[PDB]
Amino acid sequence: DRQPLNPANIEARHHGVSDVPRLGAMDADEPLFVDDYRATDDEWTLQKV
Amino acid sequence: MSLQFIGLQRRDVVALVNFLRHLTQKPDVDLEAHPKILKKCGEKRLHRRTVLFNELMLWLGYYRELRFHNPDLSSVLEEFEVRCVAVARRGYTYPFGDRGKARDHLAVLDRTEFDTDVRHDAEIVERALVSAVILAKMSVRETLVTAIGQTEPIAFVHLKDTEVQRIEENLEGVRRNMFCVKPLDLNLDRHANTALVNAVNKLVYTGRLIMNVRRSWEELERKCLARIQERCKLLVKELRMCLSFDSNYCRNILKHAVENGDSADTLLELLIEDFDIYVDSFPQS
Amino acid sequence: MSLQFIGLQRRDVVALVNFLRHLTQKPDVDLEAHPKILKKCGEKRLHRRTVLFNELMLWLGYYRELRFHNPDLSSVLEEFEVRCVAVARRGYTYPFGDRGKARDHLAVLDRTEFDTDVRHDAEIVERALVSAVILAKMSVRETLVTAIGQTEPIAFVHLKDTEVQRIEENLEGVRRNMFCVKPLDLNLDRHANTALVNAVNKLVYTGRLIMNVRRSWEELERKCLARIQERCKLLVKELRMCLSFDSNYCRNILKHAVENGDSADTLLELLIEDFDIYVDSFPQS
Amino acid sequence: GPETRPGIYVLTSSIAHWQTLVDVARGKFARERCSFVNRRITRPRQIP
Amino acid sequence: GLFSLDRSYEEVKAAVQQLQTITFRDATFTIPDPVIDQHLLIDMKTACLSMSMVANLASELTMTYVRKLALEDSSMLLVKCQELLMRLDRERSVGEPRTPARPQHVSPDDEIARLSALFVMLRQLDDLIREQVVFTVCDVSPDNKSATCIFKG
């Protein structure tokens, strides 16, 4: 959205448990969801390659 | 000095006297927030004259207790001054995109003080937070307002929308209950946030906690006056309907102006000390 | 709404919550300072899964109260910077046999300031204290250590040995119970000493008082994370021993990283709200 | 601290006007100039 | 002239008597008081106010000009100059206005006139500020009756 995503409170995710509030959060621009980082800076470079 | 009543039964008197002693402990401090207390008056059950007297004893006693406990928030007000200085010192070490623009919001924040005149305090906290909440946006590089006349409304930053809904419920109770504040279980400090931002979020909550009390106290202290002033427009005309020494003696008791509560205190105690002579003016039982 | 537990008796449940409500009042705050509380968790006597889960409800509840309180430094730390600047003026006033040596310390002390990061604040004070204690010896021309790499330890200068014990003894309480500060009525002033010397004594006292709140806090905040992560390495393996809906359900709960305390609060609020679905997995009574 | 320790200088220069003359001195002697303001904030009542 | 106003207190009454009596090499002398019949002469009042304007008008007006020029940290002294304006002797503690007070809500045009009101006081004050040399004595005759003096100015 026009507002920055900078605050960390917007981002949270979960797996393996029922998430009606998250499944009802679909299509809405906020809150958006990002997983805990398995990514590392070396592996992150390879995706751009 | 204790409040007197006409035809009320002693059980109703116990319900009223307990309401005064527990008025601070009771949630939501408003007589209109407790309609059942108005039902204790016996309205419609008795004569139109008798209802006007018992209601006047309630509002004057509801008003005198507010004069007694006195919202002396100067102790908490000193904490706002300390947390205010704690924010600005953190920002000197952090570079901004325009240090001169940031320092202008710092120096005004460092000039904070509290004059003896209570009326300024509504503007003191407001002018300080506007110099504070805008400062938090600069480190986060979020856009600040540029249009003239469009100052940013105060609001907590970097909090979950569910979290803002929770803390607003706590400020909502202070507007209804300015006396016994109950501390929140959800602290505004966040490891994810910049440590300066956590100093700002607590600075806003200290500001909202004070501005809600000065605003709510400004209303209920004024709202009690208009409810009493109507009694002079009502009880006096009821005394005109019939002429007797008890009916005539009450007419001069109401001559004192309701305006200014210090003069209003004379309207109460003088009405109580002379209660024995005009007690027959109001029909009972 | 409240921390959940498995096999604990109701008397044990109220006893644990009261330990948090009175946690600041209890001397020498540590979970290991009260070994019997770990016995109250149900060690050995209860099933091993019941112990590991209830301990998780302790450390998550213990660490959450640390965020709920958090030793504020907004008061004394601002007083430290003022007394620190006061030493900078008095330090120039005293003649020395080597003007270039005393300038090297005071030039560092003039630059003191606090970065927004909190972990660096202990480094901020110690570089000002070592700069000051070395200067204090020069006022009496006592022989400071000249060996490279030794680093002169912080110490008060020219004080009664009983007073040296009374002043350090309060810091030992700051290193154990950092909450309810009870500052000494004793004066650090000594009329026989130079005013430059007494200013350092008020400076080193607050300088130890600031670092001791931070180091003992960092010692707990670091220890609290590792104690929880050890529970995850074991409890998840116990769930692997027996496949089940509720057993695999709990494995998803611990899958999230223990790192960062903001995540720890999210880990607790979900575990309490959904505690009912998997309560059957743990044997009790 | 204890006392000033003045130096002496002789300066031939093509500059003649007094305004431009002092300005170049404000650069080369800025080190002592920093000591000048520093003593003022350090020692009230003393008036260097 | 700075003490021309207050007078009833004994401390000012004596301090003027000390300034009245100069003491120097060989002969000593006494300097007459400009004040007469309590009320000050108009010339000293024009001059004493000319210093009083610069002493006070410079206070608030210089605050904005220090904070902006100090950002360069060129000579670095301007940062110390920013704290020079607090105006105090004792190391005041935790009153919490560590920064010097600054002007607020000044009219955009009147701020220019205040600078015009500043330097104009300096021009009226300038005659007392300087003493042009007119002679430079070399040898002196005995009994100091006269001496040769090269002209200056």
Side-chain angles (χ1 to χ4, degrees), chain B residues 82 86 89-90 93 184-187 189-192 194-196, chain C residues 67-68 70 73-74 77-78 113-116 118-119 260 262 269:
Chain B
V82 178
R89 63 179 180 187
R90 298 296 179 87
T93 60
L184 43 81
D185 292 340
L186 296 175
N187 61 335
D189 295 335
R190 296 296 179 83
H191 183 279
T194 302
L196 186 145
Chain C
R67 302 175 55 87
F68 178 81
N70 184 28
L73 274 66
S74 179
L77 185 142
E78 183 178 4
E113 58 182 348
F114 296 89
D115 189 7
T116 305
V118 293
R119 296 175 178 84
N260 289 335
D262 293 341
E269 294 178 351

Side-chain angles (χ1 to χ4, degrees), chain C residues 35-84 86-145:
Chain C
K36 294 181 296 297
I37 302 300
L38 298 175
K39 183 181 176 58
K40 303 299 180 181
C41 180
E43 183 181 0
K44 181 59 172 58
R45 182 176 182 175
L46 295 179
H47 188 277
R48 297 295 301 274
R49 294 178 178 179
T50 303
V51 181
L52 296 177
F53 179 80
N54 291 334
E55 289 172 351
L56 181 64
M57 298 302 296
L58 293 175
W59 291 96
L60 289 178
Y62 176 80
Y63 179 79
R64 183 181 61 87
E65 296 299 323
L66 295 179
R67 302 175 55 87
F68 178 81
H69 297 295
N70 184 28
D72 188 9
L73 274 66
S74 179
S75 175
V76 181
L77 185 142
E78 183 178 4
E79 181 71 15
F80 171 83
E81 185 179 0
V82 177
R83 298 181 179 179
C84 184
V87 177
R89 302 303 181 188
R90 298 298 176 84
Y92 296 137
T93 59
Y94 178 71
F96 293 100
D98 44 355
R99 60 177 182 181
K101 181 63 180 299
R103 183 180 295 177
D104 296 339
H105 301 289
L106 293 173
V108 179
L109 188 146
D110 291 340
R111 295 190 301 270
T112 184
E113 58 182 348
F114 296 89
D115 189 7
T116 305
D117 294 339
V118 293
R119 296 175 178 84
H120 297 80
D121 293 340
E123 184 70 15
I124 303 292
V125 179
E126 184 180 359
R127 290 177 298 182
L129 293 179
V130 176
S131 179
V133 176
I134 294 177
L135 183 66
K137 299 296 180 60
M138 297 178 61
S139 180
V140 198
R141 294 191 297 271
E142 298 181 348
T143 299
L144 52 89
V145 296

